[PDB]
Structures are given as structure tokens and as C-alpha cells.
Amino acid sequence: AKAPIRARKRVRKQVSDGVAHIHASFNNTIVTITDRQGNALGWATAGGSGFRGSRKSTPFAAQV
RNA sequence: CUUGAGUCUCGUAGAGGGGGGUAGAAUUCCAGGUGUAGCGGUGAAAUGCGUAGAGAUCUGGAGGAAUACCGGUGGCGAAGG
């Protein structure tokens, strides 16, 4: 063993495939990637990107 | 008398009515797994929902109300329908 790399050479799972489920809501948009059996692996939102109801509800907030 | 009106047979369309029964789907709501700090609401957000484990996604469970399409100036009703 040498001293370790500056950016990772490896990654701890490799399940390859999933589903992005989007709930594009009337006030927001919520995006969650889930494994193929529907157990959610991680998520993020429009509204948490510094937006209230009034801006989180847009395709640009959803894009983020 | 049969012509107005009345009567049965018989062909027949129908969201007509009353009584009871019913299927699938949905609006709603919860838990928990997975996940992790977000969710929700407008004109503005606040009010409201969370982090004490939500929202979202999967799976389990709960209630009460109503039938999208079809569909027509159509068909039916004593009218309200």
C-alpha cells in the first residue's frame, strides 16, 4: 500500500438500475431515486433549493 | 254509434321510481421498511405539515362519499329531476 488517491478509485455498490419517481406537485416538485423494488435510496427537492411555494412550483426549480 | 274516450293481448326503447344488494377505481388518512430534512401555500406568504423520523418511494392497514369514458337538442320522469 501507497498513500491513498486524491479522488475515489472505487464505489461501494453497483446495482446499475433504478427508477426516478417524480411528484411534480401543484406547489413544488420532489424527485426521489429508488431501487427497482421501490425502496428509496436518496431524494431532493425544488423547495429545499431556497424556494417557497411561489418559486418551488416551476420547471426551473424542478430542473434543480 | 265509434270516430272522442276507455281496455287487454302483443312487439319494444329507456339515466323513470321504490326496496335491497354490489365492483373496481379514486379523493383522503396512518404505520412501518427504504431514505433523510425536508414537506406544504399564495397575488405575498403566513397560517399549516417535519426533523420527536415526515414529504417522496415501496409494501401493509383504515374510512366515508361518488360513478370518468360512453353521450346524442338522445332516452326516460308526475314534477322536483
Swiss-Prot record:
UniProt family annotation: Belongs to the universal ribosomal protein uS11 family.
Modified residues (N-methylalanine): A1
Quaternary structure note: Part of the 30S ribosomal subunit. Interacts with proteins uS7 and bS18. Cross-links to IF-3. In stalled ribosomes contacts ribosome rescue factor SmrB.
Miscellaneous field: Has been predicted to contact the N-terminal domain of IF-3 based on footprint studies; exactly how IF-3 interacts with the 30S subunit is controversial.
Organism (species): Escherichia coli (strain K12)
Superkingdom of origin: Bacteria
Role this protein plays: Located on the platform of the 30S subunit, it bridges several disparate RNA helices of the 16S rRNA. Forms part of the Shine-Dalgarno cleft in the 70S ribosome.
Protein name (record): Small ribosomal subunit protein uS11
Signal sequence residues: none
Part of the whole protein covered: 2 to 65 of 129
